[PDB]
Amino acid sequence: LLDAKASEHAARMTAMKNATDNANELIRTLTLSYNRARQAAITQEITEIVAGANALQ
Amino acid sequence: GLGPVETTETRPIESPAPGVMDRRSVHEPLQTGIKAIDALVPIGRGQRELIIGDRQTGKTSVAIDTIINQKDQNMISIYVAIGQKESTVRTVVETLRKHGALDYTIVVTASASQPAPLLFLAPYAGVAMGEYFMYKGKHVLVVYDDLSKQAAAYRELSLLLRRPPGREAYPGDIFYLHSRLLERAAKLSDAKGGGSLTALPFVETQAGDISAYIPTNVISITDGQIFLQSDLFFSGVRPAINAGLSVSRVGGAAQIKAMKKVAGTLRLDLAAYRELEAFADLDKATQAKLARGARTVEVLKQDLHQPIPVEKQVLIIYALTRGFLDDIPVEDVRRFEKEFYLFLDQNGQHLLEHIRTTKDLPNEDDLNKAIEAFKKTFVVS
Amino acid sequence: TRGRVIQVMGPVVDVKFENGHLPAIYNALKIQHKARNENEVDIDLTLEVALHLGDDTVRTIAMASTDGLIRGMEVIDTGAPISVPVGEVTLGRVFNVLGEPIDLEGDIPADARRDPIHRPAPKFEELATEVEILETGIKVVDLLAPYIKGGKIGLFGGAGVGKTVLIQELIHNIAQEHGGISVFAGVGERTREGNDLYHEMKDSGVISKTAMVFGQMNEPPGARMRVALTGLTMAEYFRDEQGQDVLLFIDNIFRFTQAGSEVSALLGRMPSAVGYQPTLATEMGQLQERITSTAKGSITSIQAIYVPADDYTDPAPATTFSHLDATTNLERKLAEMGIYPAVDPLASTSRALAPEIVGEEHYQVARKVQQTLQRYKELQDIIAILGMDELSDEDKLVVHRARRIQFFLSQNFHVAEQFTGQPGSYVPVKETVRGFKEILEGKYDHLPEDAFRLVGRIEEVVEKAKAMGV
Amino acid sequence: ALAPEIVGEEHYQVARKVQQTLQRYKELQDIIAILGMDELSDEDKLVVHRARRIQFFLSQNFHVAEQFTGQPGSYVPVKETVRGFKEILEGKYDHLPEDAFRLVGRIEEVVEKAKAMGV
Ligand SMILES: [Mg+2]
């Protein structure tokens, strides 16, 4: 039983380590997509503003 | 191609809406036949309820069921189709004619090949034809097949007339275009005559994003929403109504007493099931509650072109809300729903008649008794 | 003398006058025309001057629909801005943007007093040097989010939480205690809800101390953006002439700003960020600076704000949030459990909650209650649910007092007496501080929670528990 | 045309069940990505087990793609497709490797490919 308890705690620690690594990689890819969206939004907004301003003339 | 139309009176397309002093609070119900709508998101005569969703879901099926289910009542219907295939319009007209629904229906159409001005002016013509009956003492219902096509036609017209663009090239007054139209549906007072006009606009989203421009413009005009989702469409929930986000600001006052007494419990327990579902050892009551939720999810769904009279609705709702279904497995629930109604086809008819004539729940004990009898006559799979 | 119409492009008109006779900016002009044949319609229109374009031409915005206008019609200069009636004749009646009754009780006599719609804000030397607290009579407001004389409060909530009941209760309490009136302005909202509110106010009886102005979704952009000024000038008369303390309710301030943008592009102005008018903060400031607490009286305004798509970084909510002193949040969760009003105690904020304003005792009691509620919120969710219940000492007592304090924030209103026999109460602030302190100390720990429900002062609670068998 | 009165009643139920299992598998992708397959209930593991097989059996080998891969190409009538997916949904072929389902015409070819794989 004591051997079993030691094994249990070791397994839980290793599983948590793997889960944390996977979460970090997901964060990385999400940040890439976020930067793409940020640039697209800036471009579209400035294009709309200039297109509206050019209409008076 | 059936010959000319012999009319004598004309109405302006642009007219002002009734004022604050001309209206009355909404109290009468509009019966659609769909249990989810009639129970969780009630709709009353004189209201404006928005149906928003995606191209996959069957909004037009909801509209056609609602129009068909108005056979017994005294209501004229108007169907306005904006930017649709002419073939689909012909199929809709054929479906309407088969069910004998062209005794009280007018169809106004502007297909996708027509010039933009007609697509922009179609809803105003529909509501102007409705207002002729509204201002005499009659009740009208108007359906707008899509308003996001009227918006695009208006934007194209304004850009071609060389008017400054706005957000996403839409003109500045794109909220006014829809608010001015949807405010023409009202419930008149007794001095005005007592007529009404109900409106059911349709809106389509892209990838289920309701934070967009036009969906948010039209959400803040109507008295509630009916949100249909696609992830619930493929999970088996065929009406697909997301009761978490659907709402009805007139709700409660647009129901009969029998349904008022029973719908609150359904709302409460479905909300509890969906709230505690996310985290799903477990507590002894918890699993039971989950089962209850599942039963509700099984009892809300229904097939196409199967309208259920309100009496029967409330009946089954009651038979569910007090746990009488807990003795029958979930996969058999729908079968119960099929066999209960026919059991009332020859038994307990007086009950139904009472529910029809006093709009109130009958002697509860008797109902329970009948339920018990039916259960005695049911075979559990 | 008289001008003529040059262009008609939607809600914007152009008028040409004679040399040296141009009207000033913000003036009002009238078109009154009768059809000369069957190819014409009758016209009765009011316009407001916006710009001087040069060459004896002005650009104006219409207050109604422009259908039926013809290039060549004759326009008359009134000589002054829009003028609305003020005084005791406006109490219990309903008006529109131009100051005309839309009920059916008659017309205001032409020999009355009428005030213009546009005027400057009060000066620095004639404002209040001290912050004063407004006494509402509610218990949750007076403890966790006090109101300020001359301040601005943002009310957050929708359907199913009952904000009209809070509106009516505030009107009744203020009018009864401080002898003030109220003005309600509906700016670009639904007409159904306006009719509902009018009939509720008629039923309660608080109509005879209120003035109502309505400009809603069905109306052109010009009428929606000049209706809050009509209510404001109706309210300012009582502050400046009778020296009263007035309440001003605004149905949706956001719509105001929105309406402006809808005409900006048509006036010939380059767009700013997110397609808004370049003159946004100036307009909002020129509106919101006229409600203050002067040396005579004060105007305090409760404003309902709608955030588009719950995006708080939008220019309009971001601009209007810099004028607010407090926020009041109504929650459906507390309304389901039977707490009236449904004001959220952990989300309502105020800038007056400071020991230098209310006092040291008030601040300590309020902070103790807030931290007790926060402890309850944290503990009762992750613990005592999912089968992790436990009965630690000092955790029995914390939830015991927390439940006995959450139900003491509910109250019985006078306007709810038509559906319930309880007359209703007006609780001062010292009394509720004393009651909450006594509950916190555990003196009233030997009573059931049903005694703390729909009751005013703390002592009355005991009488309730006296009749409940405990 | 996916209506019960147009294509039949068996076809409609088979298609709806296949779509339901694919949607359920789609819902579980994130938690499999982060945690793994060891933190799931038995029903969820069964759902994944059948969903991978269905997703691989939706593929095919084409006549015009022969010059790329080499396989001659396949043609399947409707009734055979309905039968095969009905058998897959019933757990009849739950023991075969998940790779035997890729790029085949019918389900008898799945059986033959599994046989030639040493199982
Ligand atoms: Mg459709």
JSON list of N, CA and C in Angstrom, two decimals, chain C residues 83-103:
[
{"chain": "C", "resi": 83, "resn": "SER", "atom": "N", "xyz": [-38.69, 77.47, -28.23]},
{"chain": "C", "resi": 83, "resn": "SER", "atom": "CA", "xyz": [-39.13, 77.93, -26.92]},
{"chain": "C", "resi": 83, "resn": "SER", "atom": "C", "xyz": [-40.23, 77.01, -26.41]},
{"chain": "C", "resi": 84, "resn": "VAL", "atom": "N", "xyz": [-40.09, 76.56, -25.17]},
{"chain": "C", "resi": 84, "resn": "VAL", "atom": "CA", "xyz": [-41.05, 75.61, -24.59]},
{"chain": "C", "resi": 84, "resn": "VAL", "atom": "C", "xyz": [-41.71, 76.23, -23.36]},
{"chain": "C", "resi": 85, "resn": "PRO", "atom": "N", "xyz": [-42.94, 75.84, -23.03]},
{"chain": "C", "resi": 85, "resn": "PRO", "atom": "CA", "xyz": [-43.59, 76.39, -21.84]},
{"chain": "C", "resi": 85, "resn": "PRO", "atom": "C", "xyz": [-42.99, 75.82, -20.56]},
{"chain": "C", "resi": 86, "resn": "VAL", "atom": "N", "xyz": [-42.89, 76.68, -19.54]},
{"chain": "C", "resi": 86, "resn": "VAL", "atom": "CA", "xyz": [-42.33, 76.31, -18.25]},
{"chain": "C", "resi": 86, "resn": "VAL", "atom": "C", "xyz": [-43.28, 76.78, -17.16]},
{"chain": "C", "resi": 87, "resn": "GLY", "atom": "N", "xyz": [-43.26, 76.07, -16.03]},
{"chain": "C", "resi": 87, "resn": "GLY", "atom": "CA", "xyz": [-44.02, 76.48, -14.88]},
{"chain": "C", "resi": 87, "resn": "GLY", "atom": "C", "xyz": [-44.86, 75.35, -14.34]},
{"chain": "C", "resi": 88, "resn": "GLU", "atom": "N", "xyz": [-45.92, 75.71, -13.63]},
{"chain": "C", "resi": 88, "resn": "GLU", "atom": "CA", "xyz": [-46.83, 74.74, -13.05]},
{"chain": "C", "resi": 88, "resn": "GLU", "atom": "C", "xyz": [-47.81, 74.16, -14.07]},
{"chain": "C", "resi": 89, "resn": "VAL", "atom": "N", "xyz": [-47.91, 74.76, -15.26]},
{"chain": "C", "resi": 89, "resn": "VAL", "atom": "CA", "xyz": [-48.82, 74.24, -16.28]},
{"chain": "C", "resi": 89, "resn": "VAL", "atom": "C", "xyz": [-48.30, 72.99, -16.96]},
{"chain": "C", "resi": 90, "resn": "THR", "atom": "N", "xyz": [-47.05, 72.60, -16.71]},
{"chain": "C", "resi": 90, "resn": "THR", "atom": "CA", "xyz": [-46.46, 71.44, -17.34]},
{"chain": "C", "resi": 90, "resn": "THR", "atom": "C", "xyz": [-46.44, 70.21, -16.44]},
{"chain": "C", "resi": 91, "resn": "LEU", "atom": "N", "xyz": [-47.13, 70.25, -15.31]},
{"chain": "C", "resi": 91, "resn": "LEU", "atom": "CA", "xyz": [-47.10, 69.16, -14.35]},
{"chain": "C", "resi": 91, "resn": "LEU", "atom": "C", "xyz": [-48.28, 68.22, -14.61]},
{"chain": "C", "resi": 92, "resn": "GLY", "atom": "N", "xyz": [-47.98, 66.95, -14.84]},
{"chain": "C", "resi": 92, "resn": "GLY", "atom": "CA", "xyz": [-49.01, 65.98, -15.15]},
{"chain": "C", "resi": 92, "resn": "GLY", "atom": "C", "xyz": [-49.41, 65.91, -16.60]},
{"chain": "C", "resi": 93, "resn": "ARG", "atom": "N", "xyz": [-48.61, 66.45, -17.51]},
{"chain": "C", "resi": 93, "resn": "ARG", "atom": "CA", "xyz": [-48.92, 66.47, -18.93]},
{"chain": "C", "resi": 93, "resn": "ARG", "atom": "C", "xyz": [-47.78, 65.84, -19.71]},
{"chain": "C", "resi": 94, "resn": "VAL", "atom": "N", "xyz": [-48.03, 65.58, -21.00]},
{"chain": "C", "resi": 94, "resn": "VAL", "atom": "CA", "xyz": [-47.06, 64.97, -21.90]},
{"chain": "C", "resi": 94, "resn": "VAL", "atom": "C", "xyz": [-46.85, 65.90, -23.08]},
{"chain": "C", "resi": 95, "resn": "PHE", "atom": "N", "xyz": [-45.59, 66.12, -23.45]},
{"chain": "C", "resi": 95, "resn": "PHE", "atom": "CA", "xyz": [-45.22, 67.03, -24.53]},
{"chain": "C", "resi": 95, "resn": "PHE", "atom": "C", "xyz": [-44.36, 66.30, -25.56]},
{"chain": "C", "resi": 96, "resn": "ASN", "atom": "N", "xyz": [-44.11, 66.98, -26.68]},
{"chain": "C", "resi": 96, "resn": "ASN", "atom": "CA", "xyz": [-43.17, 66.54, -27.69]},
{"chain": "C", "resi": 96, "resn": "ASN", "atom": "C", "xyz": [-41.99, 67.51, -27.74]},
{"chain": "C", "resi": 97, "resn": "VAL", "atom": "N", "xyz": [-41.11, 67.33, -28.73]},
{"chain": "C", "resi": 97, "resn": "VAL", "atom": "CA", "xyz": [-39.87, 68.10, -28.77]},
{"chain": "C", "resi": 97, "resn": "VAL", "atom": "C", "xyz": [-40.15, 69.60, -28.87]},
{"chain": "C", "resi": 98, "resn": "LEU", "atom": "N", "xyz": [-41.18, 69.98, -29.62]},
{"chain": "C", "resi": 98, "resn": "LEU", "atom": "CA", "xyz": [-41.48, 71.40, -29.82]},
{"chain": "C", "resi": 98, "resn": "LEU", "atom": "C", "xyz": [-42.23, 72.02, -28.65]},
{"chain": "C", "resi": 99, "resn": "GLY", "atom": "N", "xyz": [-42.61, 71.23, -27.65]},
{"chain": "C", "resi": 99, "resn": "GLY", "atom": "CA", "xyz": [-43.36, 71.76, -26.53]},
{"chain": "C", "resi": 99, "resn": "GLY", "atom": "C", "xyz": [-44.84, 71.87, -26.78]},
{"chain": "C", "resi": 100, "resn": "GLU", "atom": "N", "xyz": [-45.45, 70.84, -27.37]},
{"chain": "C", "resi": 100, "resn": "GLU", "atom": "CA", "xyz": [-46.87, 70.79, -27.63]},
{"chain": "C", "resi": 100, "resn": "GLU", "atom": "C", "xyz": [-47.46, 69.54, -27.02]},
{"chain": "C", "resi": 101, "resn": "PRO", "atom": "N", "xyz": [-48.63, 69.64, -26.38]},
{"chain": "C", "resi": 101, "resn": "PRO", "atom": "CA", "xyz": [-49.18, 68.47, -25.68]},
{"chain": "C", "resi": 101, "resn": "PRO", "atom": "C", "xyz": [-49.63, 67.40, -26.66]},
{"chain": "C", "resi": 102, "resn": "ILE", "atom": "N", "xyz": [-49.24, 66.15, -26.39]},
{"chain": "C", "resi": 102, "resn": "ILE", "atom": "CA", "xyz": [-49.66, 65.02, -27.20]},
{"chain": "C", "resi": 102, "resn": "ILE", "atom": "C", "xyz": [-50.75, 64.20, -26.52]},
{"chain": "C", "resi": 103, "resn": "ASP", "atom": "N", "xyz": [-51.16, 64.57, -25.31]},
{"chain": "C", "resi": 103, "resn": "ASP", "atom": "CA", "xyz": [-52.38, 64.02, -24.74]},
{"chain": "C", "resi": 103, "resn": "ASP", "atom": "C", "xyz": [-53.56, 64.81, -25.30]}
]
